[PDB]
């Protein structure tokens, strides 16, 4: 009748009182005795010129040399970061793109957007052209963001409050992720490539299970929309981002909230999110301009990227962890170093 | 330095010379936002300019156009209305006949809340909004049997259509926060009018000539 | 991908002609397209260089002036002019496509090739061997050695192993050195210094006979190696 609505909320509190019991001692307790990181300094070293639109969504590669840009001019550019060289130039049926995905065997390019629809692009045809490999249809809402877990599976996340896992080669979901309440705006692949998380629009993460299809965990900490989510290198946290101006890390074993960045002089939200390689530096993009860095073991501002003029919609550092790359609202994609 | 690497310069300078070409013909293309709340007139409208968004291309008096309907697909408008900044106009349809009909939760005051969430949105501050009425050949079945009285409760006025239809049209512009950075353009559509083309045009065309002045200081 | 060229046959010396080199199957405008000749029972070696939008035009030392490249990117038909035939002029002129990106695989596929009858410095590829017996089963090692050090400043080494079967062109085998191409099997593999290089076979198989050509792609003119065959 309603006793099922009145037995979901004592099942909360008896999630929030296993919350509260594995609280014992807070991330900024363990870590004062740790060294504080230096203010980090890094320079702009390339700029990356070309886009005539809002950059919208870029991805690294695994070679940490080429990394692919989609904005709304309908161009999906392949760089080389080492000499500035656009390595292809991809038209799009749609303008419209939101995300952006390289494969991690190099051959496979992905995009999505206003569209609905997830194009799979394949850059080593026996001929010269970029060809369309395959138009993921059935999602009925914006495509928010797009992952490649092999070269024939492929997790996308839409605003019809799902994610949907898909065969390329034969062009259908297999698995649909029917959890969320609110649109789902990011993902991020776990490196063993056995779970993602994906961040919506009601303030919650949910971590899936890619083999079963179930919702797993769910973390209930923030105030409004995630825009951004990103694993740890690890595989055992994640960081998200929103507009609360907070970003805040989750622990998967600990199932709570660790540590929230947060500073007073920023009040506007979290566009984009990413790792360093070693977990200890959280890069996190922002409607100031700027993308902010923050020491992820203790809370502090470690220094702050500002040579963008407009908001800064996309980051990304390589596998290597030499650069991070920031693309931006005003049609440029600087390489930080 | 390498032969190889001079002919990869080659080609990533045959690349920006196509992709300064192809952006000169995206300048070309005046973009325009159709929007309206449901089955508001949309489909009669692109039916006169003759699963996402849906693009139509028309031209009109040497005028390339391109309009977007982003009504098709529903999810939280905050997120993707950021993609439509640089849009010459916004085409925003209100089917007049909808005082009468409620949803299942007024009509037109859907409408209103749809229009002052554009009007005053913070990506919209200086995009003009030309506002079509539609359905006026529904004066022979609405106005005469139910006055207008039944979604204005605020107005008595008089019951003829053209000063009820007045009304609607200023309660439409009274939603405009931004008198002096955008202008509402408002037409009447009956669905048997062959001059909705021109008045997007006679709009656009203002629009250029606003956006050419304030490039050059005068405005 | 397929490239068939025409307009062989025998010309008296002195006079001239026009090779034409059809592309059909792939983008050609984004290739660019050399010409390759080879005399009679000698090696390779390169005439010319047309690159994507005609913007870069590079000719051997033999041929210069003489001979003269061009394209026509809407009709995928590609043109050798040549002028003042010498006796030293009869060979088979192959057509060559070439990307260049980063990671790209040029000098990729070869036209059939056209003969042509007369009717009568630079990095120097010292591929020593003439000739090698084997037996298929075992390995086998073609050695190439060059004149000037081919790795360059930005970690490559332009070294590019061709594969000519008898009555067939020349297909590649491994670009820059360490790389194979698309299509050939795990049996070829590839190493060098920057002097001194080898292309190993790991099991010798009948359609891996032939003559196997080594190319350097540091600078140009782009200068082949003298041919190691394979008999059995």
């Known amino acids: 009748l309603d006793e099922l609505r009145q037995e979901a909320e004592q099942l909360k509190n008896q999630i929030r009182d296993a919350r509260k019991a594995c609280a014992d001692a807070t991330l900024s307790q363990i870590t004062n005795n740790i060294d504080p990181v230096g203010r980090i300094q890094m320079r702009t070293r390339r700029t990356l010129r070309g886009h005539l639109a809002k950059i919208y969504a870029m991805h690294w590669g695994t070679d940490s040399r080429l990394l692919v840009s989609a904005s709304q001019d309908g161009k999906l550019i392949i760089w080389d970061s080492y000499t500035t060289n656009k390595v292809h130039a991809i038209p799009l049926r749609s303008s419209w793109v939101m995300t952006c995905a390289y494969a991690p065997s190099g051959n496979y390019v992905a995009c999505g957007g206003l569209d609905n629809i997830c194009s799979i692009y394949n850059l080593k045809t026996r001929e010269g052209n970029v060809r369309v490999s395959r138009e993921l249809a059935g999602h009925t809402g914006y495509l928010s963001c797009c992952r490649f877990l092999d070269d024939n599976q492929i997790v996308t996340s839409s605003g019809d409050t799902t994610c949907a896992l898909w065969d390329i080669e034969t062009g259908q979901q297999t698995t649909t992720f029917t959890g969320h309440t609110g649109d789902v705006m990011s993902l991020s692949l776990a490196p063993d490539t056995r779970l993602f998380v994906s961040g919506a629009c009601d303030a919650s993460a949910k971590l899936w299970d890619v083999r079963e299809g179930m919702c797993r965990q769910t973390f209930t900490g923030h105030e409004s929309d995630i825009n951004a989510i990103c694993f740890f290198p690890n595989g055992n946290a994640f960081a998200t981002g929103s507009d609360d101006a907070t970003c805040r890390l989750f622990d998967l074993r600990a199932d709570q909230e660790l540590m929230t960045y947060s500073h007073d002089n920023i009040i506007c939200g979290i566009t984009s999110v990413s790792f360093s390689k070693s977990g200890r530096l959280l890069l996190a993009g922002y409607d100031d301009f700027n993308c902010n860095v923050w020491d992820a073991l203790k809370a502090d501002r470690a220094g702050v990227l500002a040579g963008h003029d407009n908001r800064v919609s996309c980051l990304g550092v390589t596998d290597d962890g030499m650069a991070v790359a920031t693309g931006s609202w005003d049609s440029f994609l600087k390489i930080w170093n | 330095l390498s032969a190889e690497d001079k002919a990869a310069v080659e080609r990533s300078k045959m690349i920006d010379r196509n992709l300064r070409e192809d952006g000169e013909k995206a300048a070309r293309e005046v973009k325009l936002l159709l929007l309206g709340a449901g089955e508001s007139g949309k489909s009669t409208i692109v039916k006169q300019m003759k699963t996402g968004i849906v693009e139509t291309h028309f031209t009109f008096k040497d005028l390339h156009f391109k309009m977007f309907d982003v009504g098709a697909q529903r999810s939280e408008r905050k997120k993707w209305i950021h993609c439509f900044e640089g849009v010459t106009a916004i085409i925003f349809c209100v089917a007049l006949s909808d005082y009468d009909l409620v949803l299942a939760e007024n009509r037109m005051h859907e409408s209103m809340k749809l229009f002052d969430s554009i009007c005053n949105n913070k990506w919209f501050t200086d995009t003009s909004i030309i506002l079509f009425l539609n359905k006026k050949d529904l004066f022979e079945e609405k106005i005469k049997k139910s006055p207008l009285t039944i979604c204005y409760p605020e107005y008595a006025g008089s019951n003829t259509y053209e000063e009820a239809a007045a009304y609607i049209q200023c309660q439409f512009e009274d939603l405009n926060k931004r008198k002096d950075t955008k202008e509402i353009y408002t037409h009447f559509t009956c669905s048997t009018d062959t001059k909705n083309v021109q008045f997007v045009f006679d709009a656009v065309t203002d629009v250029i000539i606003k956006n050419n002045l304030k490039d050059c200081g005068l405005f | 991908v397929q490239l068939v060229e025409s307009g062989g046959g025998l010309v008296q010396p002195g006079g001239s002609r026009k090779l034409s080199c059809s592309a059909s199957?792939?983008?050609?405008?984004?290739?660019?397209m050399h010409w390759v000749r080879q005399a009679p029972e000698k090696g390779l070696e390169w005439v010319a260089y047309?690159?994507?939008?005609?913007?870069?035009?590079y000719y051997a030392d033999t041929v210069k002036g003489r001979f003269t490249i061009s394209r026509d990117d809407p009709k995928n038909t590609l043109f050798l002019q040549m002028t003042s035939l010498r006796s030293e002029d009869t060979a088979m002129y192959y057509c060559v496509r070439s990307i260049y990106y980063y990671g790209s695989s040029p000098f990729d596929f070869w036209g059939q090739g056209t003969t042509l009858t007369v009717s009568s410095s630079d990095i120097v590829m010292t591929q020593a061997t003439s000739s090698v017996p084997v037996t298929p089963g075992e390995s086998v090692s073609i050695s190439c050695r060059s004149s000037?050090?081919?790795?360059?400043?930005?970690?490559?080494?332009?070294l590019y192993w061709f594969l000519q079967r008898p009555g067939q062109s020349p297909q590649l085998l491994i670009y820059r050195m360490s790389n194979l191409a698309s299509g050939v099997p795990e049996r070829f593999s590839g190493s060098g210094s920057g002097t001194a290089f080898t292309l190993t076979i790991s099991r010798l198989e009948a359609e891996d006979v032939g003559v196997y050509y080594c190319?350097?792609?540091?600078?140009?003119?782009?200068?082949f190696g003298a041919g190691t065959k394979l008999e059995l």
């Open positions: 000037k050090s081919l790795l360059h400043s930005n970690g490559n080494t332009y």
């Open positions: 190319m350097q792609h540091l600078e140009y003119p782009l200068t």
């Open positions: 199957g792939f983008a050609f405008s984004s290739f660019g």
């Open positions: 047309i690159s994507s939008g005609s913007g870069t035009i």
